[PDB]
Amino acid sequence: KCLAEAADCSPWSGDSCCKPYLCSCIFFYPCSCRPKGW
Incomplete structure (x- = not known):
């Protein structure tokens, strides 16, 4: 299982x-997985 x-x-x-x-x-709530490139 993993976060998209x-x-x-x-x-x-x-x-x-x-x-x-x-x-x-x-440094801001909440944290979120983002696509790679950034």
């Missing part, structure tokens, strides 16, 4: 983001 693009993410209350998407925590 633009999916909310949290260390415990979440899941690992699907590759190559990465969870973005731009």
Whole structure:
């Protein structure tokens, strides 16, 4: 299981983001996995 693009993410209350998407925590709540390129 993994979080898709633009999916909310949290260390415990979440899941690992699907590759190559990465969870973005731009110092703002909530964090969200975004597509790779950024």
